[PDB]
């Protein structure tokens, strides 16, 4: 209220002590627990923690990978937390050599069950799947307890070193010959409405385009064949209901200079990846386009 207190400078949070420090200091005792510096206090990255069975956590022990929950009409295990690579197993976009590579590592009773639940129901994938963000730490227990982030950067505790985002080469997709200073990274599930297969194409779009109309124009321009396949399935097969030939959502934005080619190793199996070092997640809902 006073002009001294109003024009007083704002208080540094790192200079003032914790509530526990002043609480212990008031009654003046001592505990064996060191309390004077609380960890994770200066953490803008709001995180969450997820239990998941052992059969899905391979190629995840290295930090930095997507995580997607699904829905299944069965009641008790109803939501599986599938990694992006097990999602890419199902996708028709990936090369068959890499497909037989990363299927050979994911031989588990939970992974094949998730693969059956992907293609069992009548729903398409975009009405079924739901992102969570990228993962930063593992637990590697008998069941695994991963730590994903909803918003913010990807870093180790104490912020000693930043965590990168990994994506396989086949899901990587750019639409410009040179990049801007900033570029967003998206998710694309495009639907081939073909007779024999309905397996989609999975992509990430490291593009410098933020506006949705100027993004969806280039999205239609690069995926004209898929919309032509959609309208061909519309005219050839009557009384069918096709919808959302491609879907699009925002995943984050990168530094546009640390993007480089590295590789993941799990059980001496190389898997080449595009790696984005200083990256912050930024989630959004599944918009669609036809």
């Amino acid at each position: 209220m006073d002009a001294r207190a109003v024009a007083k400078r704002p208080r540094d949070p790192a200079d003032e002590d914790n509530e526990l420090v002043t609480a212990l200091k008031a009654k003046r005792e001592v505990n064996t627990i060191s309390v004077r510096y609380l960890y994770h206090a200066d953490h803008q990255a709001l995180t969450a923690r997820f239990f998941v069975p052992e059969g899905l956590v391979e190629f995840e022990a290295q930090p930095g990978a997507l995580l997607i929950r699904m829905e299944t009409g069965c009641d008790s295990p109803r939501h599986l937390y599938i990694s992006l690579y097990l999602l890419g197993i199902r996708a028709s976009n990936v090369s068959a050599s890499t497909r037989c590579l990363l299927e050979s590592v994911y031989t588990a009773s939970a992974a094949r069950a998730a693969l059956q639940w992907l293609d069992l129901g009548p729903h398409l994938l975009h009405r079924r799947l739901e992102t969570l963000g990228c993962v930063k730490t593992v637990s590697l227990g008998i069941t695994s307890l991963l730590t994903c982030v909803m918003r913010g950067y990807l870093y180790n505790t104490l912020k000693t070193e930043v965590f990168a985002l990994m994506i396989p080469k086949d899901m990587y997709l750019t639409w410009e010959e040179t990049r801007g200073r900033l570029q967003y990274v998206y998710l694309i599930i495009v639907y081939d409405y073909d007779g024999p297969e309905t397996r989609p194409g999975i992509y990430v779009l490291t593009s410098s385009i933020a506006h949705w109309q100027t993004l969806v124009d280039v999205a239609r321009g690069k995926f004209a064949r898929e919309r032509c396949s959609f309208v061909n399935r519309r005219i050839t097969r009557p009384r069918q209901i096709p919808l959302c030939t491609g879907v699009i959502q925002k995943l984050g934005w990168c530094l546009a200079d640390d993007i480089h080619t590295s590789f993941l190793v799990h059980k001496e199996l190389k898997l080449s990846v595009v790696r984005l070092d200083n990256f912050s997640v930024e989630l959004g809902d599944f918009r669609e386009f036809v």
Partner: peptide, 13 residues
């Protein structure tokens, strides 16, 4: 049993 409940049961129930 539905086939998703079948994959549930072979997953464990």
């Amino acid at each position: 049993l539905d086939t998703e409940t079948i994959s549930m049961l072979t997953f464990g129930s």
